[PDB]
Amino acid sequence: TSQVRQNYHQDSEAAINRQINLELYASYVYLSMSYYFDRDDVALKNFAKYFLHQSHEEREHAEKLMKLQNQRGGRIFLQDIKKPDCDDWESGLNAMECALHLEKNVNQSLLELHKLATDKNDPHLCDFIETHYLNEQVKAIKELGDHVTNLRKMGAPESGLAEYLFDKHTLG
Amino acid sequence: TSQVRQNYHQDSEAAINRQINLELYASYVYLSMSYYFDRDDVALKNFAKYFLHQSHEEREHAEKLMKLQNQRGGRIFLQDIKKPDCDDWESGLNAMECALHLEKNVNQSLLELHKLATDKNDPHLCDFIETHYLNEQVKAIKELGDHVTNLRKMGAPESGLAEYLFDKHTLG
Amino acid sequence: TSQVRQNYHQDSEAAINRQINLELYASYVYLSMSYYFDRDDVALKNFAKYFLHQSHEEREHAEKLMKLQNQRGGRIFLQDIKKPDCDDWESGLNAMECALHLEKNVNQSLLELHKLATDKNDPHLCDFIETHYLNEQVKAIKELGDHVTNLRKMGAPESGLAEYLFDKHTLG
Amino acid sequence: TSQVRQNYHQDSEAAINRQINLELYASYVYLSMSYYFDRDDVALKNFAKYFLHQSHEEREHAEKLMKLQNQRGGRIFLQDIKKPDCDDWESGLNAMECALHLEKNVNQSLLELHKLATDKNDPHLCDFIETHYLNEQVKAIKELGDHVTNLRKMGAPESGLAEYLFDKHTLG
Ligand SMILES: [Cl-]
Ligand SMILES: [Cl-]
Ligand SMILES: [Cl-]
Ligand SMILES: [Cl-]
Ligand SMILES: [Cl-]
Ligand SMILES: [Cl-]
Ligand SMILES: [Cl-]
Ligand SMILES: [Cl-]
Ligand SMILES: [Cl-]
Ligand SMILES: [Cl-]
Ligand SMILES: [Cl-]
Ligand SMILES: [Cl-]
Ligand SMILES: [Cl-]
Ligand SMILES: [Cl-]
Ligand SMILES: [Cl-]
Ligand SMILES: [Cl-]
Ligand SMILES: [Cl-]
Ligand SMILES: [Cl-]
Ligand SMILES: [Cl-]
Ligand SMILES: [Cl-]
Ligand SMILES: [Cl-]
Ligand SMILES: [Cl-]
Ligand SMILES: [Cl-]
Ligand SMILES: [Cl-]
Ligand SMILES: [Cl-]
Ligand SMILES: [Cl-]
Ligand SMILES: [Cl-]
Ligand SMILES: [Cl-]
Ligand SMILES: [Cl-]
Ligand SMILES: [Cl-]
Ligand SMILES: [Cl-]
Ligand SMILES: [Cl-]
Ligand SMILES: [Cl-]
Ligand SMILES: [Cl-]
Ligand SMILES: [Cl-]
Ligand SMILES: [Cl-]
Ligand SMILES: [Cl-]
Ligand SMILES: [Cl-]
Ligand SMILES: [Cl-]
Ligand SMILES: [Cl-]
Ligand SMILES: [Cl-]
Ligand SMILES: [Cl-]
Ligand SMILES: [Cl-]
Ligand SMILES: [Cl-]
Ligand SMILES: [Cl-]
Ligand SMILES: [Fe+2]
Ligand SMILES: [Fe+2]
Ligand SMILES: [Fe+2]
Ligand SMILES: [Fe+2]
Ligand SMILES: [Fe+2]
Ligand SMILES: [Fe+2]
Ligand SMILES: [Fe+2]
Ligand SMILES: [Fe+2]
Ligand SMILES: [Fe+2]
Ligand SMILES: [Fe+2]
Ligand SMILES: [Fe+2]
Ligand SMILES: [Fe+2]
Ligand SMILES: [Fe+2]
Ligand SMILES: [Fe+2]
Ligand SMILES: [Fe+2]
Ligand SMILES: [Fe+2]
Ligand SMILES: [Fe+2]
Ligand SMILES: [Fe+2]
Ligand SMILES: [Fe+2]
Ligand SMILES: [Mg+2]
Ligand SMILES: [Mg+2]
Ligand SMILES: [Mg+2]
Ligand SMILES: [Mg+2]
Ligand SMILES: [Mg+2]
Ligand SMILES: [Mg+2]
Ligand SMILES: [Mg+2]
Ligand SMILES: [Mg+2]
Ligand SMILES: [Mg+2]
Ligand SMILES: [Mg+2]
Ligand SMILES: [Mg+2]
Ligand SMILES: [Mg+2]
Ligand SMILES: [Mg+2]
Ligand SMILES: [Mg+2]
Ligand SMILES: [Mg+2]
Ligand SMILES: [Mg+2]
């Protein structure tokens, strides 16, 4: 056993490794989405910028969990990062909808992680999740919902003008 | 023979003179396009600004080739600069499409020039073309493609509103 | 066909997608190595810092290739990012040796990519690889070789003192 | 009853008084350790500096708990501060090992305190412990573990050179 390990259940350790993979997966989804908008036949540079930033944030989320694993004396075990579900993201509205679904999926995993930490009476892990993950998720989900709403109201995805104007006035 | 000349084939010298003419031609096409947008019955000042800048860049491309010719000990031979294919450029979208076609034509000529330089084992000329021309062309073509895409998606050329808003938010 | 595509062979497009995956793989290897050194039973923070920086550089390499793909009118196709070969990296010396092997493997792939670009007479792609990848690889390989040499000379991996002092005076 | 008291169980009040004593005890252990390293026959000034800083931090931990007691309307009851277990701390490695054991003991007490607060549904007290104590403990334990590891790897306690170099390059 690690000399630092205390009150850190093996189930929690395993769940943290699963969460690391999921955060890296989310980084990959956003990376794919970003460069879709950089295509010459899509050409929405602020959608590209927005999703690249979200991608980099997800990687920071993963790295902080790796740091946590070591802080508590667990051992990092990495798995393949699966490719995203789509190669072609169809439209700005569709990409925002997929991002919303992704963030709610990552949130559900974080909530299950917190429930495990609660079941194992690990208040340090509970605090870590609450302080660094749960409100960030709520804010991300709200922002994506807001974006979906505006795109729908403006007439996307049929209106290429709506996508263009949203790119310029909300994402730029 | 020029006291400086070394490893510089007469075919390369001639091809450089042809490229000088083509770059000046491209400058002239963009000059014509620019002032079309300055017409009182067209009145898109940022289209005018954009194309005038592209015109001035083409002249810089020509002057750098003139400098190259002398650097290598070749002799500059100038020809008439042909007037552009159109007097009336029809719309912002049509002008962007013509610019895209022009830039791909200039690129093809540069690629043929590079192949000649390769065939004659002239690595200095190869480097000159690669370092100062080829990526600039790729970037210009990508930018023009992006512009065409947005104008089409926004509803041009039928939508005068699309042209106006593109002028203001992308070119301004 | 993409409106921007010119002189860009389908084989080159495919090879660029393969290179994107390899660069992301290299990012993952370095990420794994970094956090190994952050373990409480390893505890070499400058090894951790060094490898995390290398990880972030590899991701930048991947993103630039994604940008290239779109610039030339190719289409990005992503694959799973394989987990690294090891979970436990054994020592500072062993990790440096693995990094050296990785960088030489990535270099070989870049050289094969350049040979394809040469075979297809794509001087823009040749220049891109030469300007942004090949010297960076040569410098990385030389630096890693230098590091391996010093660790060996100092008495690693048997000397934990050698690893500690190298961490402090070369990597810090 | 205090005019401010609300949802503050008598068991929690008593447990806070016990924690105040333990934090002062930890301050005393580190004070003793610090001046051991200031002995002319030990003479490791950065070990002395490090432990004196840890001593002062423990006193701040105690004072914040005293403030908490009054904030919630409990009453502070003080007990003797026991002398540390050792007069002679043997070596830098041994002192770091004793500090690690101390911090894990203080952590266990904090975890028991948090469980009491949970059992009595006192979310303010739960938050206080999580926000101001639990991560500080995890970080302290990780840092001490890191220090023990490096000293062992470098050849302590037999190597007086290892202790000297660690003092200079990690603690200085
Ligand atoms: Cl445990
Ligand atoms: Cl367990
Ligand atoms: Cl997993
Ligand atoms: Cl796997
Ligand atoms: Cl699978
Ligand atoms: Cl998902
Ligand atoms: Cl349970
Ligand atoms: Cl709990
Ligand atoms: Cl919000
Ligand atoms: Cl908020
Ligand atoms: Cl919004
Ligand atoms: Cl507007
Ligand atoms: Cl010659
Ligand atoms: Cl000749
Ligand atoms: Cl001519
Ligand atoms: Cl003529
Ligand atoms: Cl003629
Ligand atoms: Cl043309
Ligand atoms: Cl020939
Ligand atoms: Cl050559
Ligand atoms: Cl570009
Ligand atoms: Cl570029
Ligand atoms: Cl555009
Ligand atoms: Cl092609
Ligand atoms: Cl082809
Ligand atoms: Cl692949
Ligand atoms: Cl795959
Ligand atoms: Cl496979
Ligand atoms: Cl490898
Ligand atoms: Cl071939
Ligand atoms: Cl070639
Ligand atoms: Cl070098
Ligand atoms: Cl160099
Ligand atoms: Cl070195
Ligand atoms: Cl009460
Ligand atoms: Cl009570
Ligand atoms: Cl007490
Ligand atoms: Cl007493
Ligand atoms: Cl007693
Ligand atoms: Cl103790
Ligand atoms: Cl109870
Ligand atoms: Cl509660
Ligand atoms: Cl830490
Ligand atoms: Cl932390
Ligand atoms: Cl340390
Ligand atoms: Fe975000
Ligand atoms: Fe951010
Ligand atoms: Fe995340
Ligand atoms: Fe997220
Ligand atoms: Fe330009
Ligand atoms: Fe310019
Ligand atoms: Fe040009
Ligand atoms: Fe041009
Ligand atoms: Fe590097
Ligand atoms: Fe760097
Ligand atoms: Fe790379
Ligand atoms: Fe590399
Ligand atoms: Fe030194
Ligand atoms: Fe401390
Ligand atoms: Fe401090
Ligand atoms: Fe404390
Ligand atoms: Fe402490
Ligand atoms: Fe809680
Ligand atoms: Fe909290
Ligand atoms: Mg998973
Ligand atoms: Mg699959
Ligand atoms: Mg328990
Ligand atoms: Mg918060
Ligand atoms: Mg001509
Ligand atoms: Mg004529
Ligand atoms: Mg020859
Ligand atoms: Mg260049
Ligand atoms: Mg591969
Ligand atoms: Mg596998
Ligand atoms: Mg060919
Ligand atoms: Mg270079
Ligand atoms: Mg006590
Ligand atoms: Mg006694
Ligand atoms: Mg109650
Ligand atoms: Mg906190």
From Swiss-Prot, chains A, B, C, D:
GO biological process: immune response; intracellular iron ion homeostasis; iron ion transport; negative regulation of cell population proliferation; negative regulation of ferroptosis; negative regulation of fibroblast proliferation
EC number, as in UniProt: 1.16.3.1
GO molecular function terms listed in the Swiss-Prot or TrEMBL record: ferric iron binding; ferrous iron binding; ferroxidase activity; identical protein binding; iron ion binding; iron ion sequestering activity
Result of altering residue 18 to A: Abrogates interaction with NCOA4. Fails to localize to punctate lysosomal structures
Residues at which Fe cation 2 binds: 58, 103, 137
Pfam family, one: Ferritin
Reactions catalysed, as given in the entry: 4 Fe(2+) + O2 + 4 H(+) = 4 Fe(3+) + 2 H2O
Listed GO CC annotations: autolysosome; autophagosome; cytoplasm; cytosol; extracellular exosome; extracellular region; ferritin complex; ficolin-1-rich granule lumen
Primary location: cytoplasm
Record key words, sorted: Acetylation, Cytoplasm, Cytoplasmic vesicle, Iron, Iron storage, Lysosome, Metal-binding, Neurodegeneration, Oxidoreductase, Phosphoprotein
Family annotation (InterPro entries): Ferritin, Ferritin-like, Ferritin-like_diiron, Ferritin-like_SF, Ferritin_CS, Ferritin_DPS_dom
Domain Ferritin-like diiron: 6-155
Subunit and partners: Oligomer of 24 subunits. There are two types of subunits: L (light) chain and H (heavy) chain. The major chain can be light or heavy, depending on the species and tissue type. In the human liver, the heavy chain is predominant. The functional molecule forms a roughly spherical shell with a diameter of 12 nm and contains a central cavity into which the insoluble mineral iron core is deposited. Interacts with NCOA4; NCOA4 promotes targeting of the iron-binding ferritin complex to autolysosomes following starvation or iron depletion.
Name of the protein described by the UniProt record: Ferritin heavy chain
